[PDB]
Design a protein around this ligand. Structure first.
Ligand SMILES: Nc1ncnc2c1ncn2[C@@H]1O[C@H](COP(=O)(O)OP(=O)(O)OP(=O)(O)O)[C@@H](O)[C@H]1O
Ligand SMILES: Nc1ncnc2c1ncn2[C@@H]1O[C@H](COP(=O)(O)OP(=O)(O)O)[C@@H](O)[C@H]1O
Ligand SMILES: *OP(=O)(O)OC[C@H]1O[C@@H](n2cnc3c(N)ncnc32)[C@H](O)[C@@H]1O
Ligand SMILES: [Mg+2]
Ligand SMILES: [Mg+2]
Lengths: 513, 357, 226
């Protein structure tokens, strides 16, 4: 029997002025309740979307959550893929609906803030919310105003993209002019597999038609030590290869059509690639095709960077295209989740002591942005390798003679984490030949407190630090490492003569004097 | 008949959700702890929830006062040999261990103070022997007795050992009540006020009768009980201290007639029937005799004085007059104000924080 | 007292990985990690792992890293999402004594409330605020997890309001933003959470505490009296 809430939902659909339905609910073998209904428009219709579109409201439950989704009808529904919507593909199955469910949760600018509101918890209220959002979505898509000024440029959904393989590249703002003059040209490229990762590769160098280097990408020392294999082909396009309105090409014929629209020829490119492969005996066969194009970050802005798309590599065939996901591993694209200020990220930092506090402070500094670090203390070598295996833009250096003394003098911030007085005396007795910032950090007995000392002079004042000083479990060390990192950031922000003493309390609080 | 306003009033006078989850979790935790205790492993037979909480006839305490939650511990001890004091003293180490500094003994029961509620557990024993004891224990260990949901939530609850909670995806066979030959003539024994002798009690019959009466009245009985309790609380100055609690519920249940359509009609019929039935006793200055559902030889109105009954009768007469003139009124606002004259201000007139890890 | 308990951690993201690493380093050897996502390069800005674990399941990589710490470690990984579907997985989950939630998701709280554990457990909930300015700490010892009380306590505390100006987009060619938090803040809150867990395990009960960090580097605490 049809339960009560489904009857209430049917009544709700029937009551709506801009919605009609005749079929009743139906339970599927996969325990999904579906209903067929028709939607109208209050705006002039377009070619891609008719006024009266047929949809399929579907409800099911996976573990403890109840999924509410609306799917287009396989016969009288929309066939194009717009923004804020999955790919609209109809398969040969008993299903009566396609797979192009609009993403009603996402809120475009056209979607009013008051109209969006919040998602309720009751099934009937959730259904009403979803239906209202669907009506707004369909009218906006009819107006072709789903993406407007100020919105982020989201890439189109690519059908059948493997969720395991990723290709990494590094492209910055300064590299745009280099590629701006190569629109319509092609060449070879090489890539290397990430050691220890699962199904990840990254690009290394770019070549030309005859196999001559034109650009190299700079990676961390961990990544640089790898084999390079030329198994890719690149080609620069004027714009993003997207079909109207926002549909990604699915077959080779659609890709060729988009190429012709741009003003290029896929078969000519393939013939040239084959001919050049024949000419060069060293080259075996390319296996990947890379497409480059300028890309904006917001709608209404101008392009400032080059983005690359990959597909597994004919132009006239109707076979589906295999796409591979790509990520930009540039420095400004790595720490969008939180980073330190530019004043400390551009400093060369030397740390004395690879013990407990020093290694944790170095790891925190590397993760927050400071990439130029010198480890002086094997503990130093292991710490340097671990720091280099953290992010693609890490540059850590491990460690009498005048040349070595100058190398040490090249740094800007000197931090002491040894807890030894002889090291303080040696720091005071060393000739730095220029002004530096000196910071000293030390823990007390039983890790109950922390001494923080900072100075900005040509020589390290040891007597004042000793007078200030006179006047374990892993979590304690981690706590003091975090506090010391914040103290270092604050000192570098405003250099001077600063001394502070911190103390931890049994209830879990920390006090400063 | 101003039904949505009555629904809002009922939602206002009901216990909050924090207290509800608190007493549910407390009952489950107490049951598990009692089961796992080695000294009382064989003695304890069952632990189930009773009282107005189980029967959905409880109202929200004014202020920050903790609601009363009633629990029953059924044991297999022999009452003919053991005094009530020894039986209650067998549970002291358990309370000292698991509930240090939060438990207190008073009268015939123990009192445990939780975060938002107060538990009130009573020690009882089975007065039967032989296969009858086995059948009673099997009934008392069933899912029908060991459920923590109220009667309002489970409209399909039946006093049967072959009953299971019917849960659907959105909304099978409806088992009926067990025959009276299996449970009606077998009550339980509990200590008295002074812990000197064992009395007789039978709460399962009370729960069954309340559920059946609610079913026959289209789910209006418990709401009427709550409304009358709230009315008594509001007009406390002009009303005697008694009756209150279960005796008041017994009076309300006796007064009602089967086939209730709406709440206002039910209240008017209830007060009219109450005035009609006890007029002779009122003019003779006496009190009624009402037999308990579980034990037929006991009088519920045993500790009530005659003057208390007379004062309650006068208050009921005044409330009946107000309700009678309220029901006939056709203007919604005037009727709502007349209803508010009795129930109080709670009768209406016609945020999620961000956590990251 | 805590070194002899079996500990289950739900959520192997930022806070969960650091808490698990601290617990493994201080002696707690019987741990179980439940997660069903994949590790990316962006997550490493605030995480306990490195680039050698990119593209793996978070739970499995975290479990291997934990097992590479001390010779007496014994950790297990569950790749499903709470709650599991198979009854065998539920029976495996019911063998743990302390249940720790480090996901920051309300659906997980409701699933915990609706799960049948069949015995008495210790439930601990830890989460951070906007910009990692504070920490929510909740604890209870029952057969079922109280969700309404925890939600009310979280709402009662004074916490920063969410402003979308500070929310940066995750990258070029994307739509969803991310919440701002640096590595040092997460490390501070991981240490505080480990201390809170040890204290609660020592004396179980109904406990709620709210912590706040100050610009000068101090930590203040606001408790709740029950
Ligand atoms: N006079 C009585 N006669 C028979 N049974 C009684 C009587 N008083 C109490 N009981 C029984 O004891 C149980 C608990 O009694 P209690 O005094 O706590 O009443 P109650 O209905 O829970 O009251 P309240 O609404 O004030 O919480 C009742 O549910 C009923 O089963
Ligand atoms: N907490 C309780 N649990 C179960 N039955 C109860 C409870 N309190 C009272 N009763 C029942 O209600 C009846 C009335 O009890 P009461 O008025 O206290 O009489 P007495 O003073 O003789 O004990 C008793 O017979 C008892 O069986
Ligand atoms: O702070 P953050 O977003 O990195 O933390 C989220 C972590 O929690 C895990 N998570 C979230 N929801 C679930 C459920 N239902 N089951 C198991 N794990 C869950 C995320 O995978 C992430 O590690
Ligand atoms: Mg009571
Ligand atoms: Mg009581």
């Amino acid at each position: 029997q049809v339960p009560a809430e489904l009857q209430a939902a049917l009544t709700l659909i029937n009551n709506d002025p801009r919605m009609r339905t005749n079929n009743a609910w139906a339970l599927s073998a996969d325990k999904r309740w579906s209903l067929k209904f028709t939607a109208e428009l209050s705006v002039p219709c377009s070619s891609f979307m008719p006024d009266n579109s047929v949809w399929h409201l579907v409800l099911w439950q996976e573990e403890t959550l109840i999924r509410i989704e609306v799917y287009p009808d396989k016969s009288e529904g929309i066939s194009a893929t717009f923004q804020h919507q999955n790919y609209n593909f109809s398969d040969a199955s008993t299903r009566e609906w396609t797979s192009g469910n609009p993403a009603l949760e996402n809120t475009p600018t056209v979607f009013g803030r008051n109209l969006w509101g919040l998602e309720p918890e009751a099934l009937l209220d959730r259904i009403s919310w979803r239906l209202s959002r669907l009506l707004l979505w369909i009218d906006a898509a009819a107006q072709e105003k789903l993406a407007t000024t100020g919105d982020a440029v989201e890439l189109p959904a690519f059908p059948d993209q493997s969720p395991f393989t990723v290709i990494g590249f590094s492209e910055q703002i300064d590299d745009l002019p280099f590629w701006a003059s190569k629109t319509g040209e092609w060449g070879f490229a090489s890539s290397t597999g990430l050691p220890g990762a699962h199904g990840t590769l990254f690009l290394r160098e770019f070549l030309d038609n005859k196999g001559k280097l034109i650009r190299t990408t700079k990676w961390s020392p961990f990544m640089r030590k790898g084999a390079r294999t030329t198994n890719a082909v690149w080609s620069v396009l004027p714009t993003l290869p997207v079909l109207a309105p926002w549909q990604a090409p699915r077959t080779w014929q659609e890709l060729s059509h988009c190429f012709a629209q741009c003003g290029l020829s896929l078969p000519d490119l393939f013939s040239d690639i084959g001919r050049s492969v024949r000419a060069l005996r060293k080259q075996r066969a390319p296996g990947l095709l890379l497409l480059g194009f300028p890309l904006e970050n917001k709608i209404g802005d101008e392009p400032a960077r080059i983005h690359w798309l990959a597909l597994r590599l004919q132009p006239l065939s109707q076979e589906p295209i295999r796409w591979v996901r790509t990520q930009n591993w540039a420095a400004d694209q790595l720490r969008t989740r939180g980073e330190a200020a530019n004043d400390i990220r551009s400093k060369k930092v030397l740390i004395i002591g690879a013990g407990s506090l020093g290694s944790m402070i170095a790891e925190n500094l590397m993760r927050i942005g400071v990439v130029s670090q010198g480890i002086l203390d094997n503990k130093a070598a292991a710490l340097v390798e671990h720091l280099n295996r953290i992010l693609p833009d890490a540059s850590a250096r491990s460690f009498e003679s005048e040349v070595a003394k100058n190398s040490l003098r090249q740094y800007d911030v000197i931090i002491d984490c040894t807890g030894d007085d002889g090291v303080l005396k040696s720091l005071a007795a060393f000739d730095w030949k220029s002004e530096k910032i000196f910071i000293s950090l030390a823990m007390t007995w039983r890790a109950e407190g922390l001494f923080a000392f900072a100075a900005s002079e040509t020589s390290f004042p040891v007597t004042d630090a000793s007078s200030r000083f006179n006047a374990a479990r892993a979590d304690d060390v981690q706590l003091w490492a975090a506090v010391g990192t914040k103290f270092i950031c604050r000192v570098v922000s405003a250099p001077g003569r600063i001394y502070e003493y911190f103390k931890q309390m049994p209830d879990g609080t920390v006090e400063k004097e | 008949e101003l039904q949505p306003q009555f629904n809002e009033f009922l939602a206002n006078i009901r216990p909050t959700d924090t207290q509800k989850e608190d007493w549910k979790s407390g009952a489950r935790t107490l049951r598990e702890r009692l089961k796992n205790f080695e000294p009382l492993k064989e003695i304890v037979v069952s632990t189930f929830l009773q009282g107005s909480i189980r029967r959905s006839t409880a109202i929200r305490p004014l202020g920050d006062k903790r609601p009363d939650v009633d629990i029953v511990v059924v044991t297999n001890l022999d009452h003919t040999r053991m005094s009530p004091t020894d039986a209650m003293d067998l549970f002291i180490p358990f309370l000292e261990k698991y509930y240090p500094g939060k438990w207190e003994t008073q009268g015939r029961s123990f009192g445990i103070t939780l975060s938002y509620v107060e538990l009130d557990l009573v020690i009882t024993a089975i007065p039967e022997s032989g296969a009858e004891k086995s059948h009673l224990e099997q009934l008392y260990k069933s899912e029908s007795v060991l459920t923590v949901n109220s009667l309002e939530e489970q409209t399909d609850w039946r006093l049967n050992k072959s009953w299971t909670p019917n849960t659907g995806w959105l909304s099978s066979a409806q088992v009926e009540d067990a025959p009276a030959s299996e449970w009606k003539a077998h009550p339980l024994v509990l200590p008295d006020r002074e812990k000197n002798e064992w009395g007789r009690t039978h709460p399962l019959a009370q729960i069954r009768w309340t559920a059946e009466k609610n079913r026959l009245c289209n789910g209006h009985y418990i709401n009427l009980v709550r409304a009358v309790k709230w009315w008594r609380q509001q007009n406390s100055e002009d009303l005697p201290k008694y009756p209150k609690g279960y005796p008041l519920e017994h009076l309300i249940g006796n007064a009602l007639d089967n086939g209730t359509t709406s709440m206002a009609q039910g209240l008017v019929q209830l007060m009219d029937t109450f005035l009609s039935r006890w007029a002779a006793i009122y003019n003779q200055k006496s009190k009624p005799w009402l037999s308990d559902h579980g034990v037929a030889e006991h009088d519920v109105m045993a500790r009530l004085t005659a003057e208390d009954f007379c004062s309650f009768y006068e208050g009921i007469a005044s409330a009946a007059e107000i309700a009678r003139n309220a029901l006939a009124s056709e203007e919604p606002q005037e009727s709502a104000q007349l209803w508010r004259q009795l129930f109080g201000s709670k009768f209406p007139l016609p945020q999620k924080t961000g956590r990251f890890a």
